[PDB]
């Protein structure tokens, strides 16, 4: 039986897409740039802060010094970190809270493998910290997804082998990081985005303890 489940945060437990979009829009109006609307926001999602700020600059071909650039990126981040004060347990995606309870009560290790420096805060906003045995610190991990280190550190932090672990992710880079760590990925999303090879469910309500056991047992049979 698997001994740990390794959770990404964004797109598995919740998302904060409205908060990012609000923060980006506030930043762009402050610097008198227009055209950061919802369709344009689709380009910012999941992208690094620096690349998103560059996309917003190119809307006006505005050029800035490196200190201004760093200042603008921090301004958006400070504003977003203030906005996620309002995250609450009602933001947890369907199926997730019950899955965490079932793992905890089954004594299966639960770890967070998220790139976000806001992971601890967001889990506390959602009243989930009690379920998480460890949170891999993204600052301590030099190589980010699709490199497997964040997931390797997550498995180690709870004292299980990655090969004893299932990883949950909604992004291709995360699915690849889970693969390369040796844990077993179960994607949530579409195979057009995540690949035709892994086990995939369309939405998080499929993430049940019973379904993960089905995927695990079926992986153990594959030998052979
Ligand atoms: Ca993700
Ligand atoms: Ca999504
Ligand atoms: Ca909840
Ligand atoms: Ca709380």
Swiss-Prot record:
Its EC number is 5.4.2.6. InterPro entries: B-phosphoglucomutase_hydrolase, Beta-PGM, Beta-PGM-like, HAD-like_sf, HAD-SF_hydro_IA, HAD_sf, PGP-like_dom2. GO terms for cellular component: cytoplasm. Optimum pH is around 7. Relatively stable in solution within the pH range of 5-9.5. Induction: By maltose, trehalose and sucrose and repressed by glucose and lactose. Changing residue 16 to P: 500-fold reduction in the rate constant for Asp-8 phosphorylation by beta-G1,6bisP. 6,700-fold reduction in the apparent rate constant for cycling of the phosphorylated enzyme to convert beta-G1P to G6P. The modification 4-aspartylphosphate is found at residue 8. GO terms for biological process: carbohydrate metabolic process. Binds 1 magnesium ion per subunit. Changing residue 52 to A: Wild-type activity. It comes from the Bacteria. One of its GO terms (molecular function) is beta-phosphoglucomutase activity. Keywords: Carbohydrate metabolism, Cytoplasm, Isomerase, Magnesium, Metal-binding, Phosphoprotein. Activated by phosphorylation. Competitively inhibited by alpha-D-galactose-1-phosphate. It is an enzyme of class 5 (isomerase). Beta-D-glucose 6-phosphate binds at residues 10, 46-47, 49, 116-118. The catalysis proceeds via a phosphoenzyme formed by reaction of an active-site nucleophile with the cofactor glucose 1,6-diphosphate (G1,6-diP). The phosphorylated mutase binds either G1P or G6P and transfers the phosphoryl group to the C(6)OH or C(1)OH, respectively. Catalyzes the interconversion of D-glucose 1-phosphate (G1P) and D-glucose 6-phosphate (G6P), forming beta-D-glucose 1,6-(bis)phosphate (beta-G16P) as an intermediate. The beta-phosphoglucomutase (Beta-PGM) acts on the beta-C(1) anomer of G1P. Glucose or lactose are used in preference to maltose, which is only utilized after glucose or lactose has been exhausted. It plays a key role in the regulation of the flow of carbohydrate intermediates in glycolysis and the formation of the sugar nucleotide UDP-glucose. Monomer. This is Beta-phosphoglucomutase. The gene is pgmB.
